[PDB]
């Protein structure tokens with residue numbers, strides 16, 4: 548029997564199988580408003596008892612660094628998300644909204660009034676990386692503005708309000724994007740965070756921001772509706788730490804403590820496999836070390852296949868396995884994995900284009 552199709556209780560959510568739609572930015576949410584195309588896309592991939600995580604979603608007007616990504620900070624956005632959540636729920640799926648602030652991984656073109664993006668630091672991403680522009684060219688990451696503690700508290704409140712908005716739209720929960728060199732990771736990683744106040748220096752201080760964000764959303768909507776994504780070891784946007792495993796374990800310790808204090812477990816911890824990039828024994832052991840340390844559900848992501856996902860669940864390395872690129876090109880990926888049916892190729896050229904159909908909803912079913 549296939550271990551990916553054993554049921555799993557993710558808190559109060561009864562999942563029928565362990566194949567998860569990973570969060571993926573696709574840039575079809577024109578003008579940051581969820582569009583009907585998103586409803587068709589998520590409906591195609593929804594299954595009864597299956598778990599879906601949305602594309603990263605803006606928590607505020609300054610949180611974007613990609614074109615046409617959805618927000619959930621306005622009532623117009625909430626109204627349009629509600630239509631998408633309804634069609635997914637009609638298929639029996641569980642769906643979480645990923646809350647995403649890019650921090651310094653932005654550009655004047657994505658910021659109100661062309662202002663500088665915000666970060667923990669004034670250090671820019673280096674010129675080894677270039678940002679996708681709305682016209683399909685690539686631009687230069689600018690120097691960010693380093694925020695003070697008042698502004699940090701405002702950003703935490705943006706997460707809190709967005710979590711409440713997600714519940715209003717009908718989402719089952721939210722995921723905190725704390726990975727991949729974006730705003731939260733710019734506080735976590737000692738290769739970025741050069742602060743001398745209470746949010747920088749020590750490992751404890753670098754973990755303060757993610758702790759406050761998670762506590763804020765747990766207080767607002769309940770721990771069992773909150774997932775947290777991190778990537779202590781990742782090659783993306785100059786987000787390195789001198790001791791990735793200790794960083795990961797410090798975050799896990801904080802999450803365990805939040806659960807004890809709240810008297811409830813989070814929905815899950817979601818960790819990117821260090822092998823995953825946008826453009827091996829030590830890697831696997833880092834994943835298992837974090838899993839063994841965390842008191843709760845563990846989702847693994849990054850480079851998984853049918854065989855590797857089966858291995859992960861069978862060996863106890865993870866409870867759930869999220870798939871990205873193969874879910875782009877296989878709307879019925881869950882069914883194909885169950886049947887061991889051949890998978891369709893994906894076309895990177897249309898990952899981030901705006902067409903509501905081409906490269907988005909026109910990948911065929913079996």
Ligand SMILES: Cc1cc2nc3c(=O)[nH]c(=O)nc-3n(C[C@H](O)[C@H](O)[C@H](O)COP(=O)(O)O)c2cc1C
Nearest residue numbers: 569570571572602603848849850851870871872898
């Ligand atoms: C087009 C694309 C967009 C992505 N956008 C996000 C995102 O918005 N938030 C996030 O946490 N991860 C994002 N990722 C990472 C995926 O969630 C996932 O971890 C990765 O695709 C899994 O590896 P796989 O593609 O080999 O399955 C993205 C990946 C792709 C390919």
Ligand SMILES: CCOC(=O)/C(=N\O)C(C)=O
Nearest residue numbers: 572726727783823824825
């Ligand atoms: C390389 C890791 O970064 C990602 O996967 C991502 N978002 O988190 C995007 C928008 O591609």
